[PDB]
């Protein structure tokens, strides 16, 4: 293509052609899948073009509305379950395959449909009807009961999930309650890991794990194993796509580093040393610091559960969807900080001033040598945005009053830029950002809530992390066979394991015909509700006036002619 | 499924040729080579098209020729073509199976159609499965049908109560569906304006008095306050009645200027004792019936509050306080005079809780502070009398033991001082300038508790962290006052409760640095400790507060267009608490054919009142709505059916 | 509050049919079986319909009878 606008216009015209609802009804033997792949195409191509991004995003949103409006035309729960439960067999049920596909395409306005959400809600509370008698304390007591009850409620499923109570945790909401209860017990053990009622002697290099640490360790392994399990099904494709997933990955890496540093301390520490005499950069200290940071991340990570609660849900979503703006603006803030740090170091480079300043640094009792090196200047310029820095850091141990004046002026310019210019700009930016992320704060929240629900729908990691590492009843029959993949036992899986006739197509064919009939009815209803609600419901333009005028005029002329 | 012989016939209907269509029907019977009830390629029965173009001339022909009617009624009803309905009445589907002509006619809100069906005897199945969305749809299709203004005007003898009980149902049934919530506020807030729009038809103060004073005085308004009908009381001419009743004794109070309003209020404010004692002893004719006037009682009531606090201002002065060092001191003189108000407020509180049964008492976010306001006074009195027995030694306060009954008593009284001084804010609901501001300042208070939930939890996240690092450095041996509130900020991150403290005070920049230092050279431990501290301010101080500003700012906008109607509901709910002659005494002086004729007189008001609404609703919506293509396509068919007739006869 | 001999009369005013309406007002005098100034069920006077359709041709007729 030597020219470019002809080709670009041709491509946009093509997409805008087969993105029309009317054409999808005629062609497109599978309108849902068509709209889905088409929205994906245009969303991923609105960045490749990047000059027509408005048009392509508009078209993708239009076909998303088409998918939602086509799902809307269902008239019976039977008609809905087939739509949500459908997928290509290819000889490979009812586990909401179409809905998971819709999640996979970021079709967030298709899963916010009312009756679809009703189906999911019904399938979430299967253990017990109602959940509408609940109130401020009615729901709390039944959830607190299970949150206390999860140990043996989990053990029952572990050993005897036949008929008594193993199916009671398999149910999704109970699984959620048990998981969040396990997380809360983890956090309780973490808070209690700092009390002196259990802590080991501080004056002991590389001590053996304390009993609380012994209890904590199975949670560490459980979280590591569940994150490896989650990785082994998304293949670092959606794994990185979830920012919560990145946060918990770094948390588990910090836990791994903590275990390694603790044990490598234990192999050679010999103990019996006061903490005030420990050499800097000792494995126990760094292990403790990493453990603390991991505690911070762990206690933060429960924010994700607030997507389930119908009150912190949208608020947490809006929190998430203006974090990008704060990152963009914080990059500029960091650039300005580096600039002023450069200058301030240039100025107070020579006044080293460490003859009597005991414990030199910004973080002293006197804030001395704040600008005497690049690191301390970076750090001092950070703290000044909070006011925790004082003046007289700009003073020097001499009568060089002009140097002090220009340094104070540079520091004041930095403060005016940050706390009066930049921070106010940040506020005025997120004000309009929130003003433009409230129109779809509900639909997007419901999409996130569905994403959280479907994680607990499947019969996968049904076991909370404390009772997850516990080996399966076999435990030596699945790991080995999956380990027999680099040898001849990889091919001994599709010859002797399967020897039957594979009698499934006759069910598959009837299922597909039933789904096709449902699609045919939905499409006919959508057409009959798009002609009668959009064609005859728009405005009256000048052209229609002209047509009516000319109809009258032709009438007059012909009746004149006939006499 | 297409052909060619009827595509002219199907278009002969659409053009509107009476002659050609009549011939095609005639040839249909003899030579069955054409389907009378054909289907358009887009899908429209020959009758279904004549319905759309409102042609009664050819609807007659199709109806007279045994055409398949099908759901043509349901389609005519949706298109609100009145002329076609009489023809159809007197003789796979698009709509949901549960929809019936009366249910769908109420959806369109068309009086002419609705009145015509109800005479035929149609009935609306009143509200109360294995399948979910045939119930939730049908239930919403019922409620939206019987929440329609036009249907309520025909059935539902008492339109006001019907718009009241119903609006309660939808409001309390949105929270149970929780997913059709938007589709239900669309209905509850639709019938909340029906009440206001029917009450506006009143054309005299007489016809207004009957509405409110029906099942004495202001019978119905006491009820609409219960149903949170806040768009019904804010009606202006109704609010005019209240103000003319809230300034009852003395006329005017419009001529008085800025300073004129003030002299005559403070002057009553300084006569509150004598204006209450006169009612206390003899409310015969002189002044005991002056307090009974709603305004004056408010001023006396408000005056008492001010005076009450005034002692709280006095109770802390050294001139009236007792000796500093007195184990369980005897009550001081001002405290003794304080005591009547404490009992005064409790007595009216128990009276308030008696008429609400804790279900209406708990609803106000005021009585939740009023309760703790009083309940901390029992903890004030009980502690002092406990300190008055088995504790009297006149011992210097330095050596007093912690948790001593007086110290608990003094603090718990101090806290109750705040919960009382802040409680006069509710008296600002009356001031027209601080009224809308205060009510709109509390309508987004919830959107701050919802957000100090996160900051209460992020604060736990780092307190979990910084403790886990520093807790091996206690150092609470050398530096006296091993706490945070000291001159030299000792070991702020030492215990869990000290780090909950240390982090909280950091949001105000009150926690200096070097609290992150340690009494050693572990410059890594300090640094990571300082980093955790620093990144806490970034998340909270500059990112969480900023998203709190950016969130109330939006939340304010949704509560601004109704920041006035809400306020007059808060004011009326404050006025009406003084209208009734109940607790009509300030706290310190507090402890010391009968209805058949009325009914048939009130029924004649509603019958005119509703008739005054319908005749003033069609002139405002049925002849004032926008213009759409479906009307334009009618005029073409209106002329084509006329040119094909004038030419056809020549 | 309905009838039959007026519903065509009221429609004739609504349809603008000046031809039929003059007959009813001319046939009313001989046989008082039709209410000239009646009210339709929705509530609109016969003459008020002509006021509503801005049709001067029958307004002059109505006021004339
Ligand atoms: C944008 C950079 C402004 C200069 C900042 C500065 O440090 O100069 C302050 C000067 C002198 O104060 P210092 O130099 O800070 O000691 O005083 C003013 O001019 C106040 C003007 C107040 C202006 C808000
Ligand atoms: C935000 C929760 C922080 C809890 C930290 C803490 O335990 O200290 C209590 C803090 C300050 O009291 P100190 O313990 O002395 O720090 O008071 C409040 O939180 C008032 C909030 C009332 C808000 C209306
Ligand atoms: C927004 C200013 C960023 C500039 C970075 C900088 O000055 O150095 C980082 C400093 C490191 O030095 P400390 O103040 O000791 O933590 O603080 C942070 O880590 C906060 C970043 C955490 C932000 C989430
Ligand atoms: Ca994860
Ligand atoms: Ca009270």
Author numbering:
A (entry chain A): 186 to 277, 283 to 753
B (entry chain C): 28 to 118, 136 to 172, 186 to 272, 284 to 660, 696 to 753
C (entry chain D): 28 to 92
Could you give the paper's own sentences about this structure?
Here we report five cryo-EM structures of TRPC4 in its apo form and in complex with the inhibitors GFB-8438, GFB-9289, and GFB-8749, as well as CaM. Within the TRPC1/4/5 sub-group, TRPC4 and TRPC5 share the highest sequence identity of 70%. Both proteins can form homo-tetrameric channels that allow the passage of Ca2+, but also Na+ ions to a lesser extent. The architecture is typical for the canonical TRP channel family with a transmembrane region (TM domain) where the pore region of one protomer domain-swaps with the voltage-sensor-like (VSL) domain of another. The cytosolic domain harboring the ankyrin repeat (AR) embraces the coiled coil helix in the center and the N-terminal ankyrin domain is associated with the TM domain via a helical linker domain.
